[PDB]
Amino acid sequence: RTADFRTLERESRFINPPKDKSAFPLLQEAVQPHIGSFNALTEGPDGGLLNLGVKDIGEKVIFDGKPLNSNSGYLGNKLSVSVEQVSIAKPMSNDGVSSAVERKVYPSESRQRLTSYRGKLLLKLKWSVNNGEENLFEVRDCGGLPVMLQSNRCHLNKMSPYELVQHKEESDEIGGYFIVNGIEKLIRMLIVQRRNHPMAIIRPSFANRGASYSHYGIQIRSVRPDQTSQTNVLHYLNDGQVTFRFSWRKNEYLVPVVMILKALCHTSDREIFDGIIGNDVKDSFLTDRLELLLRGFKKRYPHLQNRTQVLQYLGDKFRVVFQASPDQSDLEVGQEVLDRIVLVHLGKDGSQDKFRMLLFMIRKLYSLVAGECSPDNPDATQHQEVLLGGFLYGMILKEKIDEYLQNIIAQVRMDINRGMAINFKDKRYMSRVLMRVNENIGS
Amino acid sequence: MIVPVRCFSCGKVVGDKWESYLNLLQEDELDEGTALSRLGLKRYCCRRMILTHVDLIEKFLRYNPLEKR
Amino acid sequence: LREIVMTASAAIKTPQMTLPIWNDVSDEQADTFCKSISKVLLSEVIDKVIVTETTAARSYVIHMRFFDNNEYSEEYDVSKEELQNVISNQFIHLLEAAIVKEIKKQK
Amino acid sequence: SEIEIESVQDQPSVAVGSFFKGFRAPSDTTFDLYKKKKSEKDEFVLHGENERLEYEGYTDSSSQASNQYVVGLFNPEKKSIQLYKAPVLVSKVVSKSSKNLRGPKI
Amino acid sequence: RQIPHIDRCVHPEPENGKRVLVTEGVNFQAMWDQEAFIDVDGITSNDVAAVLKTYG
Amino acid sequence: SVVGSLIFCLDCGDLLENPNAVLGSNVECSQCKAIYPKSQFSNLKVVTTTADDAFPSSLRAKKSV
Amino acid sequence: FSIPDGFKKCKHLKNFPLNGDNKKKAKQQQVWLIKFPSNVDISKLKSLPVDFESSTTMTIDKHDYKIMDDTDIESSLTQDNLSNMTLLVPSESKESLKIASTAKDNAPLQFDKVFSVSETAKIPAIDYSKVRVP
Amino acid sequence: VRKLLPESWGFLCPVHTPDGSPCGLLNHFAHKCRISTQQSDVSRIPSILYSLGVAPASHTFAAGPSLCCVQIDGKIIGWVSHEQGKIIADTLRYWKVEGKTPGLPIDLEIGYVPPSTRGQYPGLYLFGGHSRMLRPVRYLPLDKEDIVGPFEQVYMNIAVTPQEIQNNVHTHVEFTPTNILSILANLTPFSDFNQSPRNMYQCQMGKQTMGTPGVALCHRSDNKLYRLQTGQTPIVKANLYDDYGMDNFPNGFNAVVAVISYTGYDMDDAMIINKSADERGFGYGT
Amino acid sequence: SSRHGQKGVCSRKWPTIDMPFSETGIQPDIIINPHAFPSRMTIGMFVESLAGKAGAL
Amino acid sequence: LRLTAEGNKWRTDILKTSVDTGREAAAEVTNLDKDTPADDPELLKRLQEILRDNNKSGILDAVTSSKVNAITSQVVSKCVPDGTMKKFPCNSMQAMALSGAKGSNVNVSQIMCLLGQQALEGRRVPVMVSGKTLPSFKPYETDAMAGGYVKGRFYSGIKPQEYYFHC
Amino acid sequence: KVPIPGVKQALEKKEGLFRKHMMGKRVNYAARSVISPDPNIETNEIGVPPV
Amino acid sequence: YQRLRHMVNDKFQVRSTGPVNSLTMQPVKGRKRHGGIRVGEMERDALIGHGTSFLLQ
RNA sequence: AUGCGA
Ligand SMILES: [Zn+2]
Ligand SMILES: [Zn+2]
């Protein structure tokens, strides 16, 4: 009597399956990290991860070259396109189109038919004209997004075993996978750097970036509420210079860290010094490297005298690449860059908090350089977290809606660059443009 | 799938002894050992045949596509 | 085996040369010779280096506090006179060249 | 051995201000106090100006709401403290040179 | 003190053969001056190229 | 303020141009306008040292146990 | 300026008897800074066990507390004025705050003692005899 | 990268690993591991920390390896002494296992990193966000469950069983050491009696085993299925065989085995079956 | 394969008459060579044999 | 596979001696006086100095390894052929290794005596940066087991802390 | 972006038409099968299944 | 005991005649294509080792 | 090409 057979209990469960709660709650809890992950893209805080993502993509502005005959360099042609909400519907199929009675579509059907198990993806498009002169809402259907089984978007999410058997399913079907063309696929979980925490790494690639690079460096993987990531690296140059690495359009970019410091918040050099060394006034090692950093920045850019000028230099120097154009001034492009690159885990208006953390990363980097602390291990489980398949889903969706809006803007650019036949105000134009880009993101 | 007809190792027909064995575990509140002793499965090849069985057919049969549900 | 057969590399990773020592060669003589051939870097004898940079030229007072004379004399079989010759001839010339190189780095 | 408390003053009077290491300001520099009577508590704001710069300081409301600063003056001989609630204000100093900008584009 | 190409001379325990000293570097010409302790006729090395250049 | 070999503007906290390089007997801040090469002049010195790592050796190993 | 309309001007201040019992370097007076969780009502105190020097544990509404006192951070016996924890002294309800001092030396003053009220916690010991059953 | 690290204890299985190229790359979560899918109560944590003696980062004005940095999700909220670092970490763990601090979710991960000579850089890095790997262990001071993540575990003394609890050292104990094994590794009986790589080849065989894939097979249309009809429940099993219900999907059969070289066809890796047994349907599959 | 990762192909389908029979009147289902265990150290399989035998009886 | 009551008596009695071996070697490589307390603060600081150095840690591993391997050699040489519950012929497990049909005296000692010291890339168990080789081990544990020496055997099983090292 | 290979790519690398179809080839009159033991055949023979 | 899905017994294949790739006229690939097993480079080396040059041809 | 059997 230690592992006794559950014989009558089992055979009873085989003959008369549970009608209220599956047994073996570990069996459902084992795939909980998948299903739960997919539920967080449709329900949760604010509206779920996906609605935060579309709230973070913001706007895509385009100016029809508002002729008007400031009206010749201020155009007077603003078109702000965005996405307010994103809705996902449970699988349905209506035949002959509309004029039919709709039926719920079950996984058994997708498997028997050897087809995907799609849910209609809808997203509330916002067509804002002249910054507010005219607002247009449109719910656009973006094709069938494959829904995860037993998730908050599959009909089997809440079915009792008895109902599950009544729907031709494995009385215990865990789910968490996708029926795509009838083939069951799951998204493999991945081990990625632990978010939001500076990891001190010595890497010979860091020396491989070029001259004056040391091995030492800091890597923080900032992840936004919507779970999209942005890796930020600090490098200690052999010269004492510290450079800040980031990646945009999967291209890498280096900026002096003292620039992102003077750019985040208005401060004195003595405020950065106190931020870094503090009470530690006795580190000749750190006092001198920091004198090289601050004095060196004062050397390169003697005319960046205040934070605003610095912001203008960053927006002005990246305006060609952040695709924000005349639609923004170099101050706006600069601040939008800061908010979009530097420690995005701290969020908008976290620029003092981003300042404090960035100084903490510089200090950690000098503690690594001196050798007063050990380096961390990227491959230790200590320093790692798990990218859940559903989260990859939300990130790739966010990117697809960003591209979809980029495609609208491209379509307006082509139409206006070959005809300029019609104004941003026409509802006809909304239907026409929307009908000329491809919106089947489900496919 | 379904209670085997015979014990693989020995050869004694066992397929007749399933339902009574299950009755003996329910109705008589017996224990699996004594139930198998009263069934005459006095060898472990036989003992294990019925003792370990998993009559999965009851789970299969609820999937019968030839009747409305 | 790859380092030999595959590449015939003229740069072994661990190049060694075996030296047979005469039957007459004492074990103590052998340890003396082992010290006598091994390289001794200047770093290997330095205990502490204090640089007091004062700046109205930019003054660098470089203080090299070595081990005890007998300490490096019993680990590396070298004298204070050899330290004089090496510092006064080699070390300074190389550091002064590196400082000039750092001026080029400045400009 | 414990120090006794003599008096407590609960209404705004004295303030405390964080600055750069070296702040000294003119022999006459003046500090404007503000009181944004917001619901339960009054988040404060300090503002001053000088011949070149202007210094503005404010409270970290999310840390202010979870911790509150008190300053008192003790006499060893009278064993008495005059207690004063004082806001700690993280102040930044902008100059006249810090108020110039470039064109809105290249 | 540096003999070109030679780093360290160590005193490993003798085994299955004559007493020897194993150096961590290869420089025959330099051991040629040390003949009063080393039977030069019995020098050997793991460096094939250096042997080819010196001993043929 | 002077720290180590850095001297910050006393009024504005800017790391003002080093007194050693001014073209006057009195420099000023690039943020404010304070007088310094003229006032107190500093005697900038740092006792810099080795990290007690650059110099591995058997003798250091005999100093570590 | 008088910005964020959500703010009001000041109208009520109180004189600071900085010198009614001060004497230049002769009165050993002190000013202290103490950090108080909002959960405590300072006005409901009567004395302060700051005199405990280090063992400044304190009990406020049957709650047990520890008062951390530190010299560091701003009273270091190392540098001249290691603090940016400026004292801003008023004068009248119709005057703006002033930099603390003890005479007209354009020199800021520090807090003689800095204290911090820290919330204590039960942290009960492990019952080894109950847990380590074989 | 493939080296099995001790950090993975309780999070990744030490035996659920493929054999070949992927070895060490394709880990498997422990049967008791969880993944955070939300984030909570980060907003109330600053208030309690401030009450516990954390100096506000605007007010602290100090930074260094000489001081503990309290951070929440990579938001530096304050600074304290390393001593107060440890007092905060432990009293915080007490308020976590207690039920009196609703701004403090049980599943918060409290990363304490003590001061260490050339060690990991000190601090009190709390984490509450998603994708954290979290596992239950039994907290002894309240004899109640506590969720620990892989970051804090490194510096935590978790006794493996109650009788090995060392005085004044282990602050938690495993609920069961099976919590460090994956599902299939627990399904393997007496897995602690075999050479490790034989247990790993056991995971690959049982994982490659022809069994019962489902029971709705008349309503699937796989390119291939292998379904054993004569399936049985092991006499010898882990209790997780019942707790995970694997008896719903039996993958084998109980055979009378003689460990005997006798026939001359059982060498190295080859085994003999009874003919009459196969004729009676033994291991019969479709 | 057993639950011990000791996999083997069936070399032959031995006649029941040719199998060895115990004094209990049975002939085994499977015969595994003993010399496989000394390299693998699959002694968990030995214990599973003696536990399944006890538990069947 | 069984030993006698005698063979288990010798096996357990010899295996009682590794408890000194762990710290005794830790204080040899640390270069501190004999019987130095397992909780001397200087011992812990010296051992952290060793942890931060890969070479010094290599010396500590190699010396602890040689000593506990000397305990293994003792255990097998005492038990094994003399202490088995049934001998030679009467013992097929010994027969296969000794004839060399299959197995080795190493395998036979791993079943009947002890597993012994696990190694990786040529040395003892990895240690976390906290100074711990497993969560259950206090930082810098000088116990031989904490380095990965498994006293348990396949015939009587291995403790879970030991299963993680043999894994 | 995945440009159709030319004759230089067709001839070289792992394949090298020379390596994949010249230095080694598929062959006729050949079979592949899982091997099974048998002590009753000669040590110089191979038991061929009647297929 | 568990039955592995890999009945590699069934994976046997023999080809004495079949299709050939048009670019080589050599046996096509794959069991299901009735393709022919590869005599690889190492098997070529081995046949040269044996002196079996008429077998290698 | 991915996974995988030997
Ligand atoms: Zn039978
Ligand atoms: Zn200035």
- Domain definitions of chain F by residue range: 1-65
**Does I have 3 or more CB contacts under 8 Å with H?**
yes
How far does the centroid of ligand 2 lie from the alpha carbon of residue F18, in Å?
Answer: 12
Q: Is A57 in contact with A228 (CB distance < 8 Å)?
A: no
Q: Please choose, from the candidates G132, G22, G114, the residue with its C-alpha nearest in 3D space to the C-alpha of residue G72.
A: G114
Within 8 A of K36 by CB-CB distance, chain I residues are: 9, 11-12
Phi, psi of H241 (to 5 degrees): -60, -40
**Is residue G32 helix, strand or coil?**
strand
| Look-up of token digits 């036949």 | A421
Quick check: is J164 in a domain? no
Contact G91, G98 (CB under 8 A): yes
Token digits of residue G115: 């204290």
Cα gap H145→G17, rounded to integer Å: 57
| Cβ–Cβ under 8 Å, residues E48 and C9 | no
Protein residues contacting strand M, judged by Cβ under 7 Å: H 18-22, 26, 204, 208; I 7; L 6, 8
- H57 conformational bin, left if phi > 0, alpha if psi -120 to 50, beta if neither: alpha
The whole-number Å distance from A144's CA to M1's C1' is 28
User: Residue A182 in contact with residue A372, Cβ under 8 Å?
Assistant: no
Structure tokens at A73: 């360099």
Written as one letter, the residue type at K13 is K
**Helix, strand or coil, per DSSP, at residue J51:** helix
The Cα–Cα gap between D56 and A265 comes to 13
J70-97 as b/e: b if 16+ CB within 10 A: ebbeebbebbbbebbeeeeeebbbbbbb
In the reported structure, the alpha carbon of residue H282 is separated from the centroid of ligand 1 by a whole-number distance in angstroms of 13
Strand order in H75-80's β-sheet?
H55-56, H75-80, H68-72, H123-127, H109-113
Instruction: Please name the amino acid found at residue K42.
Output: E
Q: Tell me if A173 sits within 8 A of A164, measured CB to CB.
A: yes
D5–G48 CB contact, under 8 Å: yes
Q: Distance of CA H63 to CAs A54, A258, C16, F34, G73, Å?
A: 37, 18, 51, 29, 10
Integer-rounded Cα Rg, in Å, for chain G is 21
Burial class (CB in 10 A: 0-12, 13-18, 19+), G103: exposed
Query: Which sign does the torsion angle of CA A44, A47, A50, A55 carry?
Result: negative
Q: Which of A354, A353, A311, A357 is closest to A334 using CA atoms?
A: A311
Which chain D residues touch A266 with a CB distance below 8 Å? 92, 94, 98
The reply to whether residue G131 touches residue H162, judged by beta carbons under 8 angstroms, is yes
> How many angstroms separate the Cα of J125 from the Cα of each of J21, J57, J166?
17, 11, 10
Quote the CA–CA distance of H180 and H173 in Å, as a whole number.
Answer: 12
Distance, in Å, from the CA atom of B55 to the CA atom of C60, rounded to the nearest integer, reads 90
Q: What is the CA radius of gyration of chain E?
A: 12
A50 and A148 in a single domain? The answer is yes
Q: Residue ranges of the domains in chain B?
A: 1-69
Round the CA-based radius of gyration of chain D to a whole number and report it: 18
Phi-psi region for residue F36, left (φ > 0), alpha (ψ -120 to 50) or beta?
A: alpha
Query: Residues of D1-10 as b/e, b for ≥16 C-beta within 10 angstroms?
Result: eebebbebee
For residues H31 and H186, the answer to whether their CB atoms sit within 8 Å is yes
Partners of residue I9 in chain L, C-beta under 8 Å: 8-9
Nearest protein residue to M3's C1' (by CA)?
H22
* A272 and A396 assigned to the same domain: no
What DSSP designation does J153 have? B
Distance of CA B60 to the CA centre of its chain: 16
Residues 6+ apart with CB under 8 A from A353: A346, H75, H76
Residue pair A215/A221 in contact by the 8 Å Cβ criterion: no
- SS3 assignment for chain H: CCCCCHHHCCCECCCCCCCCCCCCCCCCECCCCEECCCCCCCCCHHHHHHHHCCEEHHHHCCCCCCCEEEEECCEEEEEECHHHHHHHHHHHHHHHHCCCCCCCCCCCEEEEECCCCCCCCCEEEEECCCCCEEEEEEECCCCEEEEECHHHHCCCCEECCHHHCCCCCCCEECCCHHHHCCHHHHHCCCHHHECHHHHHHHHHHHHCECECCCCCHHHCCCCCCCEECCCECCCCCCCHHHHCCHHHCCCECCCCEEECCCCCCCCCCEEEEEHHHHHCCCCCEC
Which of F1, F3, F12 is nearest residue D95 as measured by Cβ atoms?
F12
Q: What number of CA atoms fall less than 13 Å from residue H25's CA on the CB side?
A: 6
Return the structure tokens found at A215: 């091995």
Domains: count for chain J? 1
Name the fold adopted by H38-129: Hypothetical Protein Ta0175; Chain: A, domain 2 (3.90.1070)
Say which nucleotide is closest to residue I1, CA to C1' distance.
M5
| Interatomic CA distance for residues J60 and J49, integer angstroms | 12
Q: Which two tokens stand for residue K11?
A: 């001839």
Residue with CA nearest to M4's C1' atom: H20
* Nearest-angstrom CA–CA distance, A50 and A227: 9
Give which of B65, H104, L46, H84 is closest to G68, Cα–Cα.
Answer: H84
What is the 3-state secondary structure of chain E? CCCCCEEEEECCCCCCCCCEEEEEECCHHHHHCCCCCECHHHCEECCHHHHHHHHC
What's the burial of G7, exposed, middle or buried (CB within 10 Å: 0-12/13-18/19+)? buried
Residues G48 and D24: their CA atoms lie apart, in Å, by 33
CB under 8 Å, gap of 24 or more: what pairs does A230-233 form?
A: A230/A340, A230/A341, A230/A344, A231/A193, A232/A341, A232/A342, A232/A343
User: CA-CA distance, F60 to C71, in Å (whole number)?
Assistant: 10
DSSP designation for I48: H
| CB atoms closer than 10 angstroms to residue A142 | 23
L1/I9 touch (CB, cutoff 8 Å), yes or no:
no
* Whole-angstrom Cα Rg for chain I: 13
Can you say whether residue H281 is alpha, beta or left, with left for phi > 0 and alpha for psi between -120 and 50 degrees?
left
Could you say which DSSP state residue I35 is in?
Answer: G
Query: A234 has which bridge partners?
Result: A218, A244
SS3 content of chain D, % helix, strand, coil (to 5): 5, 50, 40
A366 and A416 housed in the same domain = no
Binding-site residues of F for Zn(2+), please? 9, 12, 29, 32
φ/ψ of residue H227, rounded to 5: -125, 115
- How many angstroms separate the CA of residue H277 from the nearest CA in chain A? 25
Domain extent for A252: 196-377
Report residue A8: phi and psi, to 5°: -65, -40
What's the DSSP call for residue G47?
A: E
Determine the Cα–Cα distance for residues E21 and C27; give it in Å rounded to an integer: 10
What b/e readout covers A314-325, taking b as 16+ CB neighbours within 10 angstroms? Answer: bbbbbbeebebe
Query: Which residues, 6 or more positions from K27, have their beta carbon under 8 angstroms from its beta carbon?
Result: L27, L36, L37, L38, L39
Q: Which nucleotides of M are covered by protein (CB under 7 A)?
A: 3-6
DSSP state of L42: H
What proportions of chain F, in percent to the nearest 5, are helix, strand and coil? 10, 15, 80
Which residue intervals of chain G are DSSP H helices?
Answer: 128-131
**Partner residues linked to F37 by β-bridges:** none
- DSSP bridge pairs for F48: C51
Nearest by CB: J135 against H158, H164, H195: H158
Judged by phi (left if over 0) then psi (alpha if -120 to 50, else beta), residue A325 lies in left
Name K23's Cβ contacts closer than 8 Å, sequence gap at least 6.
L41, L44
Over the range H251-268, which residues count as b (16 or more CB within 10 Å of their CB) and which as e? bbbbbbbbbebbbebbbe
Residue G67 three-state SS: strand
Nearest Cα residue to A160 out of A39, A9, A23, A15 = A23
CA H181/CA H244 separation, integer angstroms: 14
The beta-carbon neighbor of B47 closest among I25, I29, I56 is I56
G37 touches chain H (CB under 8 A): yes
Instruction: Please answer yes or no on whether A279 and G84 come within 8 Å at the CB atom.
Output: no
Chains that touch F (3 or more CB pairs under 8 A): A, C, D, J
- Across the interface, of A270, A309, A331, the residue whose CB is closest to D20 is A270
Q: Gap from H37 CA to M3 C1', in Å?
A: 29
**Exposure string for B45-69, b = 16+ CB within 10 A, e = fewer:** bbbbbbbbbbbbebbbebbeeeeee
Q: What is the CA radius of gyration of chain A?
A: 27
Smallest Cα distance from D88 to chain F, Å? 20
Least CB–CB distance from L41: residue in K24, K32, K51: K24
Residue A340 neighbours by CB distance under 10 Å:
16
Rounded distance between C-alpha atoms, residue H39 and residue J59, angstroms: 46
The C-alpha atoms of residue A354 and residue A342 are separated, in whole angstroms, by 7
Tokens of D74: 């003790």
Chain H, nearest residue to B52 by Cα: H233
Nominal resolution (angstroms): 3.8
CA atoms of E51 and J164, how far apart (whole Å): 49
CA of A317 to C1' of M1 (A): 42
The CATH number corresponding to B1-69 among 1.10.10.60, 1.10.443.10, 3.90.1150.10, 1.10.10.10 equals 1.10.10.60
Which residue's alpha carbon is at the shortest distance from the C1' of M6? K34
Q: What is the CATH number of the domain that holds J80?
A: 1.10.132.30
Residue J36 to residue J43: CA distance in whole angstroms: 8
With respect to residue J165, please indicate whether it lies within any of the assigned structural domains. no
Closest C1' nucleotide to K34's CA: M6
- Domain assignment of residue D87, given as a range: 1-106
Alpha-carbon distance I36 to E25, whole Å?
Answer: 49
Task: Measure A230 CA to nearest chain F CA, in Å.
Answer: 32
CATH number (domain holding residue A241)? 3.90.1110.10
Question: How far apart, in Å, do the first and last CA atoms of chain D sit?
Answer: 70
Q: Rounded CA gap, H30 and H9, in Å?
A: 9
Give ∠ CA J46-J47-J50 in degrees, rounded to 5.
Answer: 95
| Minimal C-alpha gap between H121 and chain J (Å) | 11
DSSP C91: I
Q: Does D60 touch chain H (CB under 8 A)?
A: yes
Nearest CA in chain J to A372: J52
What one-letter code names the amino acid at C98?
A
Whole-angstrom distance, CA of residue B23 vs CA of residue B16? 12
Which of G88, J161, E15 has its CA nearest to residue D47?
Answer: G88
Give the whole-angstrom CA distance, residue G103 versus residue I22. Answer: 110
Distance in angstroms: CA H20, C1' M6: 12
**Measuring CA to CA, which residue among F54, F18, F53 is closest to residue F36?**
F18
Distance D88 CA to ligand 2 centre (A): 24
Residue labelled with tokens 């039994």: H138
- Give the SS3 label for residue C50: strand
**Which residue type sits at L36?**
G
Residue reference for tokens 């929440």: H72
Alpha carbon of D102 to ligand 2 centroid (Å): 22
Cβ contacts of residue K32 below 8 Å, gap of 6+?
L12, L13, L14, L31, L37
Q: Which helix (H) or strand (E) holds G38?
A: none
- Alpha carbon distance D72, D82 (integer Å): 5
CB pair distance less than 8 Å for H232 and B52? yes
CA distances from J2 to E42, J79, J93, J108 (A): 56, 11, 10, 11
Q: How far is CA A326 from CA A61, A320, H260, in A?
A: 9, 10, 86
Q: Domain for residue J110, yes or no?
A: yes
In degrees, rounded to 5, the angle at the alpha carbon of residue A425 between the alpha carbons of residues A422 and A429 is 50
Task: Name the residue with tokens 């706007």.
Answer: A59
Here the contacts of H258-261 (C-beta below 8 Å, separation 24 or greater) are: H258/I20, H258/I28, H258/I30, H258/I31, H258/I32, H259/I31, H259/I32, H259/I33, H259/I34, H259/I37, H259/I46, H259/I49, H260/I20, H260/I28, H260/I31, H260/I32, H260/I33, H260/I34, H261/I33, H261/I34, H261/I35
Structure token digits, residue H243: 């707790």
What length does chain B have?
Answer: 69
Query: Helices J41-52 & J18-30, crossing angle to 10 degrees?
Result: 70
Yes or no, beta carbons of F8 and D22 under 8 Å apart: yes
Q: How was this structure determined?
A: cryo-EM
Query: Burial of A119 by CB count in 10 Å (0-12 exposed, 13-18 middle, 19+ buried)?
Result: buried
Do A272 and A213 sit in the same domain of this protein? yes
Residue showing tokens 């994956």: H182
- Tell me, letter by letter, the H, E, C secondary structure of B18-60: HHHHHHHHHCCCCCHHHHHHHHCCCCHHHHHHHHCECCCHHHH
Which tokens sit at A77? Answer: 């042609």
E strand or H helix at K15? none
Is J25 in a helix, a strand, or coil? helix
Nearest CA to H91 out of H153, H36, H171, H167 is that of H171
Instruction: Give the residue on J whose Cα is nearest the Cα of F65.
Output: J31
Burial of A74 (0-12, 13-18, 19+ CB in 10 A): exposed
